[PDB]
Design a protein around this ligand. Structure first.
Ligand SMILES: O=S(=O)(O)c1ccc(/N=N/c2ccc(O)cc2)cc1
Length: 121
């Protein structure tokens, strides 16, 4: 149905789409919060966060791959934000707070970043 992979993808176009999307993530203020900014194991009281989560891919880092073009394609970006949802789903072992923060994100985020990948191409 024309989505994900289609155009040659330039970070300027990609972002045109992947920006409002990552934004839809951010608008979830807390729900996106364990992602937007580095989880901050020093803050959340986490010692081995970068041991548990191999790729927390903060919504700031993802937004960066966007500002710089470290994806060459939108789904690579979604892979990052889903890489994020992962640190949520890998650490919060499905039964924690940020787990709900993410699950909701994935819900909204993609609810926008899906037709976005399509919007994009
Ligand atoms: O900025 S806050 O809204 O105050 C806040 C509060 C708690 C948070 N917890 N983050 C976690 C991340 C991983 C984990 O396994 C457990 C917790 C993160 C942010």
């Amino acid at each position: 149905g024309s989505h994900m992979r289609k155009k040659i993808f330039k970070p300027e176009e990609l972002r045109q789409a992947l920006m409002p999307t990552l934004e839809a993530l951010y608008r979830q203020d807390p729900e996106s919060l364990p992602f937007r900014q580095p989880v901050d194991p020093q803050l959340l009281g986490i010692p081995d966060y970068f041991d548990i989560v191999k790729n927390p891919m903060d919504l700031s880092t993802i937004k960066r791959k966007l500002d710089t073009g470290q994806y060459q394609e939108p789904w690579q970006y979604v892979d990052d934000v889903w890489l994020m949802f992962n640190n949520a789903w890998l650490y919060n072992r499905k039964t924690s707070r940020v787990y709900k923060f993410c699950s909701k994100l994935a819900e909204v985020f993609e609810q926008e970043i899906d037709p976005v990948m399509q919007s994009l191409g």
